[PDB]
Structure 1
């Protein structure tokens, strides 16, 4: 045969199943071959010939199975391998697709992406097995999937990290998994997998030790995995096996009551001097029953907050778990200098031999901090490199608790402490627990990074790659994963199963769910429902550009599935603007909650029509953002929810309100208070802004969607205008449970991301006083009033979309509406069906997001009464000053919220029937 002669570039050939290669470079070329070398690079010798073995490819047509699996490759020129190819032999080393002209002169040569053929060859067999260090009756079975590795050894380490054994593992030909079976004496042992494996990024047969991707226990800072039996009673708090979910999640009416408090382990306790010092920033702070923080959460729970959602508490990578390598702001500046060489070489080096703590230094820097001298963030940006603080969207191991939140990060101790926290939240605080999970990316990839785990063990399989270059994509921020590949889908479901069964997690929030296939999220839900039939899944289902590779798990595509998604519709209508706003747009783009139209600031050009459009989105969201809900829009037109525009997209997208998570604040982007501070008119005084915060939250808390909120909205939480505070430390993320202030105006935010906002910040920042104890207590009262109202009646939380459509309506709609007045009715009368609430025949929710008093005549002649919960709050109520006249007319003061009711008599009454449209 013809010798190819006369280098390798890119990686645009795709070996997608046993006998199919997709490659643009082989088109119309007469000689197309797949060369391979076990132990070196497919390269030309001194002669210039390609002497490595090869498999010849013949042009062919893309099969239907291939086009279904990889629609983004379906137009690639297809080539067929001989049916007798030993795929397992080729996959052990480098493969290169080579095209040549009829004489054998090289036309192009490229590397091969093999994830498709790996799935087609091994995935079914490998999916039938279980992975990790698995303690059994007979002892232990280790198993790791590594279908391309040339060798795998199990390295066993002593407690002091001395090698005590290195065991060659046994490869299973059908699955490509490696196993090793031993005695029960290996319980508690540390271990890694010694890999000998070709990595296409380096084109080397690499040799390295890697922790177990199915690790369930770790040494300090995740350097070694550890054999554990999570069922061990020594790893459980007393009574763990009997722990029950305090809030039901079985029916859609159950789910709709979900009211989420999105929290972070350090944000909760890092500043609370009434938490024991040894527990600040730890899981166990939730057991400090006498602390300000825990007492505050207990009162929130009593008032109707039902779920704590935890920011990453799986093993993140971006905090060093070796305490001697970390300095926090409560510690001496001298400690910071000894762990942080960037500080020691900085303009702040003069503080190294001082006797001040870092937070004492930051405090003194506040007075002269400004846009022209952003020195608080200058020092804090250095502190952030070596402190204990990160949101943790940086996955190191998916199925071990984070070590730095434990009092002892070495070994199994963190498992019991994590469970002690979960038990404290459920049994002692009475709230369910949601975990934020981040399967959409890894912290790192490639053969060299300390935190690259999956991509060292099966290179180029667990990460999503560019079709041409083979580079790991970074749409997520970081190292994009590939949940469309079967063995990572399995890893995800197996991981969720441990969190569900062994840690008793009640629901899961999928970070960047839009990068997952719809089919994969649904398959995971099917598998977890077998373990916990009431588990709830939701996530960020924005529109993504992965739609060319598979049907994405988005808001639109999840309609009717029961998987929830955050809604950005009510969020942006009430907050104003969008997450991408910068500069003067942050002030111009007022929301319903900050007086769009009705209380304009000096920069906005918002029209009355535009303000009323935001109210349409807000009403639609209060009714659960349903595609088929019927309302009267700003022009008097009859519209389904899907016909209300949201930046060119159909606004209403859901089938049931339990598919919609409404919110006006979250860990991402500016806090609600900082948004109100950007947007409020200069003449809106401090007490008005507090009511703006409460009016904004009322659209969520009194709405039919699931209610979600940021830890501290009830305390007017500020991040000093920081938009993206993931690494902004204790300083900018502070929540003060002693109620002295809301952390506003503690220095200009990080210049790298908010520098473009310094001008507008300086112009708005000092408009009114910073909240103090009086305002914090009044906001907490407002907040607990809203959650208590939501909790008090099943009419707020109907759950079923058809039931919402049969019962929920709006008044003050159309072209003659009073702008900013949101009036929702919920029917419990005879035309709705059964009475769901024996105390009332109907409810009216009136939110007057306006600086005028408003009078309503819609309920004239009815028996309407102000809710007793709000009457009991007196002049501290959001309904303070509301008047219900004899004739049924109702007057609301400025910036007020009233829940009114028709009292139910001896039999079900007429109620508030939905108007015909």
Structure 2
């Protein structure tokens, strides 16, 4: 939360302007239901047309500026138009100008950036007028997406733009910037590949970027980038504009737009898709945001006593269920798809968004390209939004095609996320085997006690690390006192192997491949770059671990049996085998999903000693992965194993 004490008044309006209907009344949602596609400003040299939805305002003006920090040069009254909107046509070339709206609501005058801003001045305090077709890179017309047959074929790599390149030995020129991720042939310590070439070399398929929309000045001051700065960016200010600090010049409204497009273009050309982390559940400050200045009381949620609903713990919630805000969110997502060619969205605190909005998002995206991903945090959380309407795990039956982070699997694999010392499956805790099995099955209702929230495996995102909470390495350290470094590395590798061999959608945190550490920091949202950078020196010292992750990713690609699209397939082909404590064993039988081999066998071994394991009588097993752990494969077949790690066997066709 960056929301501050507000030294001012919120006036919710002169109700005579809206026929005696208050912005808080239920009947208000039935009025002023503007359906047009032209909210915002449409620039052309001949003229610019403005449209603002502000039904409770008695007056509205367009305020024109020649510079991002100048004095107004014109203040033009708008015409009250249809369905609560205001319109203006300026019959001059407005190129290079900036603007705000000024409204009178009740007795208050307030000035605000356009909620539909597609470009802004530094720190997002004024809307910038320009033709966004001038920001398209060369060949943008021919941008082509890497193929994607199923959500279960994605391998997501979660990355922050500043983390990627800001380490001083990253070998990347535009450190901390969108353009840093376009640079090819970059080299780190000992000449290792870094940056984009490191990521493509891993074999991941999607880069999921932490907030790249424009977030608040409290997070990062775009005018002070010559001083230390860092923030994850979960404090939204301008939803439809990129963040200024990731551009080479935040004072050039076009730079951040062109450079983000160059990033997306380069990733697509190198075989990667891009997922945007989006935060439609709250804004940086409910009192200061343009929504509240322009239509106070409408776009954010209020309790019955007229205080903010604060279910996000960030000070406010967006009222996604009200028609014009649902419209705003959908049109925002469509802008990122159409203008920037984005390939997926990760919804922060998706349980704060209503089901109707999420399903309409999915429906509109499916009309364009069904391979666009939609995943989110479907946590169960209190809010004034009624429980049955929250887009969370409890309601996953109502959210077809939307993936949710599988926290039950996360905790079963690596131990409790909040009680740091507690072991899980990998680290020798007792009784976590069934939790791992539930995740192996993609979170579906597999059978018996093996069930979670997913109807279909495309609804379950598997992970053991993300930007939140301790890294997997740091969590292992806190929960394994007395264990050696080598023992902890084996546990870490086992956790990654579980993610990449489970049904569902595998999700990796950037740097998990070299056992990323934050030195024990649990919540690094504003920690300095020394805590948050991708440590390319550590990467250079962990090339064996990086190759191990690469080989797991390659194993999953080679075997469609790990990527079954439906729950019926999983229930027909996945079989859990009897297995001793601190192990999990399963088979994927009968060419599951088109697998080239007749059968697969997978053992997750968290037992450090020697075991003789029974193998199912399915044919001549052969080792395909983890041979270092296999002392013998006896052809009444048995597997002689030792040590912590994954083993995969197959019966050839």
TM-score (norm 1): 0.66
1:269 correspondence with 2:179: no
1:823 aligned residue: 585
| 1:462 to partner: Cα distance | 0.8
**Residues 653-691 of structure 1: CA distance to partner in whole angstroms, max 9, x if unpaired?**
111111100111111111101100011141x21111111
Q: Residue 439 in 1 paired to residue 259 in 2?
A: no
- Check whether the contact 1:272–1:291 (CA below 8 A) recurs between aligned residues: no
Question: Structure 1 residue 129: deviation in Å?
Answer: 4.6
Q: Which residues in structure 2 correspond to 1:490-505 (within 5 Å)?
A: 490-505=327-342
Report the alpha carbon displacement of residue 194 of structure 1 after superposing the two structures with TM. Answer: 1.2
Matches within 5 A, 1:823-842: 823-829=585-591, 836-837=594-595, 839-842=596-599
CA contact (8 A) 2:414 2:475 kept: yes
Match of 1:397 among 238, 262, 269: 238
Residue of structure 1 aligned with 2:619, choices 862, 865, 886: 862
Tell me the residue number matched to 2:200: 301
Q: Distance in 2 between matches of 1:791 and 1:272?
A: 34
In structure 2, runs of 5+ residues without a counterpart are 1-11
Return the alpha-carbon distance in structure 1 between the equivalents of residues 611 and 597 of structure 2.
Answer: 25
> Take 2:463 and 2:202, find their aligned partners in 1: how far apart are those partners?
18
Aligned to 2:108: 206
Instruction: Return the offset for 1:455.
Output: 0.8
CA distance in 2, matches of 1:501, 1:511: 21
Q: Quick one: structure 1 residues 319 and 238, their matched pair in 2 at CA, closer, same or farther if it must change by over 3 Å?
A: farther
Match of 2:371 in 1: 534
Aligned to 1:286: 181
Task: Tell me the SS of whatever aligns to 1:624.
Answer: coil
Match of 2:485 among 686, 697, 700: 686
Structure 2 equivalent of residue 414 of structure 1: 256
Partner of 1:152: 60
Work out the CA distance in 2 between the residues paired with 1:302 and 1:268: 15
Q: Would you say the 8 A contact 2:17–2:57 is kept in 1? A: no
Q: Give the structure 2 partner of residue 191 of structure 1.
A: 99
Whether 2:504 is the aligned partner of 1:738: answer no
Any conservation in 2 of the 1:211–1:223 contact (CA below 8 Å)? yes
Matched residue SS, 2:208: strand
Contact map agreement 1:272 1:736 (CA 8 A) in 2: no
Match of 1:571 among 410, 416, 422: 410
Instruction: List per-residue Cα deviations over 1:546-594 (Å, max 9, x = no partner).
Output: 3636511011212261111111111010111133x3xxxx21x200121
For residue 168 of structure 1, what is the aligned residue in structure 2? 77
SS in 1 for 2:49: strand
Q: Deviation of residue 467 (structure 1)? A: 1.0
Residues 488 and 504 of structure 1: CA distance in aligned 2, closer, same or farther (over 3 Å): same
Q: How does 1:742-891 map to 2 (within 5 A)?
A: 774=541, 776-812=542-578, 817-829=579-591, 836-837=594-595, 839-859=596-616, 862-867=619-624, 870=625, 879-886=628-635, 888-891=637-640
Q: Paired residue for 2:357?
A: 520
User: Over residues 478-526 of structure 1, what are the superposed CA-to-partner deviations in whole Å (9 max), with x where a residue is unaligned?
Assistant: 3211101111111100000011111111110000000111111101221
Q: 1:359-393 CA distances to partner (integer Å, 9 max, x unpaired)?
A: xxxxxxxxxxxxxxxxxxxxxxxxxxxx3210000
1:561 equivalenced with 2:400 (yes/no): yes
SS of the residue corresponding to residue 530 of structure 2 reads helix
Native 8 Å contact 1:261 1:305 kept in 2: yes
Q: Say whether the 8 Å CA contact 1:247–1:432 is kept in structure 2.
A: no
Describe the SS at the equivalent of 2:244.
coil
**Preserved CA contact (<8 Å) 2:352 2:390:** yes
1:828 CA displacement: 2.5
Helix, strand or coil at the partner of 1:391: coil
Q: Secondary structure at the match of 1:185?
A: coil
- The match for 1:593 is 426
Secondary structure of 1:442 counterpart: coil
Q: Is the 8 A contact 1:670 1:723 kept in 2?
A: yes
Does the Cα contact within 8 Å between 1:714 and 1:780 map onto a contact in 2? yes
d(CA) in 2 for partners of 1:235 and 1:865?
55
The whole-number CA distance in structure 2 between the counterparts of 1:675 and 1:170 is 59
1:245-283 deviation line (CA, Å, top 9, x unaligned): 21415xxxx210111111001111110434344x11000
- Please give the per-residue CA displacement for 1:433-482, whole angstroms capped at 9, x wherever unaligned: 10000000011122xx3xx2111111011111121143453534232111
Aligned to 2:32: 122
Larger radius of gyration: 1
Instruction: Please give the alpha-carbon distance, in whole angstroms, between the structure 1 residues aligned to 2:46 and 2:589.
Output: 62
- Specify whether residues 720 and 439 from structure 1 end up closer, same or farther in structure 2 by C-alpha distance, changes over 3 A only: same
1:164 Cα deviation from its structure 2 partner: 2.5
What SS class does the counterpart of residue 809 from structure 1 fall into?
Answer: strand
Q: Structure 1 residues 165, 304: closer, same or farther in 2, change over 3 A?
A: same
String of CA shifts for 1:719-764, please: whole Å, max 9, x gaps: 1111111011202113211337xxxxxxxxxxxxxxxxxxxxxxxx
CA distance 1:840–1:895, change in 2 (3 Å): same
Report what 1:219 is aligned to.
121
Equivalent in the alignment of 2:9? none
Query: What is the aligned partner in structure 2 of residue 105 from structure 1?
Result: none
Verify the 8 A CA contact 1:115 1:461 in the aligned structure 2.
no
Match of 2:537, SS? coil
Partners of 1:883 and 1:113 in 2: CA distance: 73
2:136 to 230, 236, 239: 236
CA 1:184–1:549 in 2, change beyond 3 Å: closer, same or farther?
farther
Equivalent residues, number: 634
Indicate yes or no: 2:462 matched with 1:621: no
**DSSP 3-state at the match of 1:843:** strand
Distance in 1, matches of 2:76 and 2:610, equals 78
Give the SS at the match of 2:454.
coil
Partner of 2:4: none
- 1:548 is aligned to 386
CA shift in 2, pair 1:706/1:395, >3 Å? same
Offset of residue 297 of structure 1:
4.6
Taking structure 1 as reference, are residues 391 and 507 closer, same or farther at Cα in structure 2, changes over 3 Å only? Answer: same
Q: Which residue of 2 aligns with 1:72?
A: none
Equivalent residues of 1:438, 1:510 under 8 A apart = yes
| Residues 101-137 of structure 1, C-alpha deviations (whole Å, 9 max, x = no match) | xxxxxxxxxxx652533312112xx133521112369
Residue 355 of structure 1: aligned partner: none
Deviation at 1:542, TM superposition (A): 1.1
The structure-2 alpha-carbon separation of the partners of 1:261 and 1:276, relative to structure 1 and needing over 3 Å to count, comes to closer
Cα deviation, 1:853-881, whole Å, max 9, x if unaligned, reads 222222357211111xx4xxxxxx67454
Instruction: Note the C-alpha offset of 1:710.
Output: 1.1
Mapping of 1:29-108 within 5 angstroms?
Answer: 38=14, 88-90=18-20
Give me the whole-angstrom Cα distance separating, in 2, the residues matched to 1:302 and 1:276: 17
Query: How far, CA to CA, are the matches of 1:237 and 1:866 in structure 2?
Result: 48
Q: What is residue 425 of structure 1 aligned with on the other side? A: 267
Contact in 2 for aligned 1:861/1:888 (Cα 8 Å): no
